[PDB]
Automatic annotation (TrEMBL), chains A, B:
Superkingdom of origin organism: Bacteria
Residues reported in the UniProt entry to bind NAD(+): R29, I31, D50, D77, V78, N101, K176, I205, T207
A Pfam family: adh_short_C2
Family that this chain belongs to: Belongs to the short-chain dehydrogenases/reductases (SDR) family.
This protein's record includes keyword Transport: no
InterPro entries, alphabetized: NAD(P)-bd_dom_sf (IPR036291), Sc_DH/Rdtase_CS (IPR020904), SDR_fam (IPR002347)
Database matches in PROSITE patterns: ADH_SHORT
Molecular function in Gene Ontology: nucleotide binding; oxidoreductase activity, acting on the CH-OH group of donors, NAD or NADP as acceptor
Protein name: Short-chain dehydrogenase/reductase SDR
Keyword terms of this UniProt record: Nucleotide-binding, Oxidoreductase
Entries under Gene3D superfamilies matching the protein: NAD(P)-binding Rossmann-like Domain
Amino acid sequence: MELTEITPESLRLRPSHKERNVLITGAARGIGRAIAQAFVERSATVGICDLNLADVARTCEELNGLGLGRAVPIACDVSDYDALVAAIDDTGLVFDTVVNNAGISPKHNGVAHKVWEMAPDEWRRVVDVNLTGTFNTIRALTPGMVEARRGWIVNTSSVAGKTYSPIVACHYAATKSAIIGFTKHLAAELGPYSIRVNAMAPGRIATPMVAGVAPEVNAEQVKLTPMARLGQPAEVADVALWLTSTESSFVTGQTVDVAGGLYMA
Amino acid sequence: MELTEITPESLRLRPSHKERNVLITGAARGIGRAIAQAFVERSATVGICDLNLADVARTCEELNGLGLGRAVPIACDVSDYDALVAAIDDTGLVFDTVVNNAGISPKHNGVAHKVWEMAPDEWRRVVDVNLTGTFNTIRALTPGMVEARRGWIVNTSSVAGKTYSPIVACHYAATKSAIIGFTKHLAAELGPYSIRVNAMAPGRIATPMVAGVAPEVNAEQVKLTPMARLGQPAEVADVALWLTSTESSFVTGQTVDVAGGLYMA
Amino acid sequence: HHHMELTEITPESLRLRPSHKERNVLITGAARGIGRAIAQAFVERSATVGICDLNLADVARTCEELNGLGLGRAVPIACDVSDYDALVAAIDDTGLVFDTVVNNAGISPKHNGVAHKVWEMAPDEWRRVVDVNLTGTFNTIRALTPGMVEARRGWIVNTSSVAGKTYSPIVACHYAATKSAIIGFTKHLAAELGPYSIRVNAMAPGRIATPPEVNAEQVKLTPMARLGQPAEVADVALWLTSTESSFVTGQTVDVAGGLYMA
Amino acid sequence: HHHMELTEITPESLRLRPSHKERNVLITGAARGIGRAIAQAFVERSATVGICDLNLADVARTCEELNGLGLGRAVPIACDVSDYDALVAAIDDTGLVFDTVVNNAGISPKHNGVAHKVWEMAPDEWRRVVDVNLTGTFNTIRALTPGMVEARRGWIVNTSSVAGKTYSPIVACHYAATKSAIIGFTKHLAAELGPYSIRVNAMAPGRIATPPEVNAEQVKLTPMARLGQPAEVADVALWLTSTESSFVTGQTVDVAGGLYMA
Ligand SMILES: NC(=O)c1ccc[n+]([C@@H]2O[C@H](COP(=O)([O-])OP(=O)(O)OC[C@H]3O[C@@H](n4cnc5c(N)ncnc54)[C@H](O)[C@@H]3O)[C@@H](O)[C@H]2O)c1
Ligand SMILES: NC(=O)c1ccc[n+]([C@@H]2O[C@H](COP(=O)([O-])OP(=O)(O)OC[C@H]3O[C@@H](n4cnc5c(N)ncnc54)[C@H](O)[C@@H]3O)[C@@H](O)[C@H]2O)c1
Ligand SMILES: NC(=O)c1ccc[n+]([C@@H]2O[C@H](COP(=O)([O-])OP(=O)(O)OC[C@H]3O[C@@H](n4cnc5c(N)ncnc54)[C@H](O)[C@@H]3O)[C@@H](O)[C@H]2O)c1
Ligand SMILES: NC(=O)c1ccc[n+]([C@@H]2O[C@H](COP(=O)([O-])OP(=O)(O)OC[C@H]3O[C@@H](n4cnc5c(N)ncnc54)[C@H](O)[C@@H]3O)[C@@H](O)[C@H]2O)c1
């Protein structure tokens, strides 16, 4: 199944996010790298947040070569609140938007551990990164957003947070489920200051994780997808662009699946 | 609370929906009229479907005066399948998109009847219009969409279909609830042909219905809205534009609230 | 290699406790399938049950079978639940005041075992499914809530489906839409009727052994690795109408063994 | 002018039926509030209960009170549920194999009665709420599911909240996030554990009279026009661990009288 909906270049590169400073976590690989690409294409300045300085610097060099938006490095572990704040403030920029995309889904020899064999320290690390890392950026940035009465937040859930995916472990499902109600609650607290908070729940996206899934499983997942293909990272990025744009100006608290019909709930 | 997110004109009038034929039901007043405005502004051809020929013709004259997209008249009752098909085909156009916006919410002296006083014929009429009218356009248009492997559908639910609103009667809540699971099911049936199906669930929108609600009730509803205002019809229209655009190309089966945080569920 | 054995057996002493003594319970679709098992369960709990279904002979036979149990009592209510006037007349003819209704009547039309897709669906078929599954459930609630409200006493259980919350390839779009309608209808009713102490809930069954490769695939998709039994749906309807769910209202509880969770 | 009287009274003969005889049920947060009422209910149904809470004196007093009822039995399990090793050691010290756990332990920190907003929230406070409400619930499930899986027998009930599905202005964001986590965690567990006949469900209470203008506003928002009683939450936990919910798994059932339905 091929791609059917192609956005013309003149629309793809419109400066919809000019004069915006957008923090993107997990931006050096995968969906986060595609989200960074899309915001730069829309003329935003992006903060490239990821773990390894070389990965972050390479990403900034790639993006800055496009002659569109600008990319600045923010190398840190999002679960370390003080290190995150220090790396954000080292840029000298004030970020009006955060896309929380960093996330982990640990496996062992390619398979997720079941709850009865799950190491507590693995559970805790996944909670720290997937859930508390998303709180951390929001705690860091919302004082400024509230004072400015201006801000946009997009979090990343998963269809596995709303129904069972046999590909993930229980910590992943629990943390992605947490994001949904967290996003509603945040939308209510921050709405009075005109700040909007939404989440994306991707299904199965063409990403490095695909090679780690057994080929029969990926085949079955595509068979379980009405649109009959994996999603592209750029399609998730299009949703993050829209949720942070003036064309979703009354949309808040929502979790939008980006999944082609897979595992609807 | 004033509007904070203003889309520049150069983006508002971009020809994102050029060469698209978009059927809009309930297009002569309210949110549907704003949806028709938005699609014409994006260079689509729109089929103006509403009950009264004079209302429909006036709407087409207004829209065609903009020098952007084109509007054609489709005067019919969406609950009458044969009359709907006849009015669609009288235009000589093939519609690749339908926005099901027509809906009714009957009240008596400004108040909704409770279930224990609800006339069965009133229940049935609301079901006929709100639910079966939405099926009718989809039944009429999906043979062509499936054959073309091309099509977009947007339905209209309500936050009252997912949680209780004291402003509506039970037929309204039931029909708007129906839309949510109907939309998921349709997305799964039509996805193999690359057709996407989504729904919008508006909260409280600045529309003629506002005057029919007691002022204390509207005041309380705005107080229950985190973003502290009614939504604008154009903000719902922005969501319909996006859900029918190439920038939501992997989004299907979703119900997106357009409600500023009111009655999140 | 598919179906697991039953693991949770209620003892007879507890199965037959008079938990619903002095209750009058209307059950639609009661002549066969899940509805027949719901009727059996309420009679076992010493309730009086109204057996509502289409065919008088089927309804009369069901009443005779249940009344032979020597526990609760069963009375006949032969009518099409989508016909409000006929429903009211049939209820009136029993002389009973029903404090509870379990809306179980429902249809899922297929054609030689295959559901029609939306693009090929006859509008008359869509309308009939809406009339029975959705408006038939409204009809009983409209008929009975005046009395329930006046008494500040009543219990309602509606029947949704996992297919109303996510896609089941076994059903057509009218079924999905009507079962989806029940979920928000049930929340709305719970709020309207709550001030009068009336509770309103719904059940969303998965795949229940009622009236083969398709069922094997459904079992493969069910974590608990079996079909549900009609009596297990009946246990949920008993609980949702009992004093032991006294603060539970507006809820849709799946009865599905993990199938199609949403 | 707010609270309605109780309308649905379970008779004593049915309240004290031995529905959970020969069951070993671990209850976290059992020394007060809803957890104490859950413990009371299981003992009334002749179960053996593990009373898990922080303070040994509180836990010992609770066991003494319950054991004086002459029905089920209560054993002490004093530990912080967020400490996996301490939890396992305290369970091991009872010498009991628990076939059921009700995860009720939870915290909702406030400051002089007001929840902190996200922009002013101490990260340490967020982390502690995550550790107790979410990871503490994982900890008991990790400790007990090896035995449940090996036996192909077990029941789990977790505790969410209506605030995990929609906004409650009474709670802070950590509470909302952790209670939201429980819903999808429960579905995932139901699927993983279902092949072994283990059922996993959750309760989402609304506003329960546990440890005034704020509560009056909550009653005004509740269709049934009263606070819930702890025993009514306990009735749901009894049912979800009983043979009469034998095909129900992965579900989150609100216990809220219509408050904040979502
Ligand atoms: N790929 C899919 O199909 C899919 C589906 C549903 C949801 N998601 C979600 O989308 C997001 C992106 O996933 P992906 O597939 O692109 O993953 P990925 O592993 O390819 O990339 C994740 C990136 O985040 C970074 N990261 C991890 N932990 C971090 C930390 N503590 N601090 C900072 N950066 C950190 C990694 O270094 C990496 O660059 C995740 O939240 C994931 O759960 C992905
Ligand atoms: N206004 C709100 O706050 C709000 C909130 C949630 C959902 N909605 C939904 O948005 C949609 C638009 O509502 P609105 O407030 O603009 O209403 P409206 O009453 O102002 O306009 C509805 C339009 O639909 C037309 N219509 C009605 N029945 C029709 C039929 N059988 N065939 C064809 N056209 C028909 C009417 O003539 C009218 O022009 C409805 O589906 C409504 O349920 C509105
Ligand atoms: N069996 C399942 O796996 C399953 C799954 C999900 C939901 N459900 C729902 O459970 C309910 C019972 O299903 P079942 O499997 O027992 O079905 P069934 O077809 O075996 O029995 C349904 C009964 O309802 C009666 N009925 C139908 N239309 C009626 C009408 N207009 N008036 C009065 N009675 C009418 C039928 O005559 C029959 O006795 C239905 O609402 C169904 O949609 C069933
Ligand atoms: N009361 C309500 O209205 C309401 C509403 C929704 C959800 N809930 C949930 O119901 C559950 C019970 O609430 P409650 O109102 O009875 O609260 P409570 O504060 O009265 O009692 C909770 C009990 O848990 C214990 N506990 C706390 N942290 C613990 C830990 N780390 N280890 C062991 N025990 C610990 C406390 O000591 C206490 O005995 C909680 O999960 C709560 O979030 C309550």
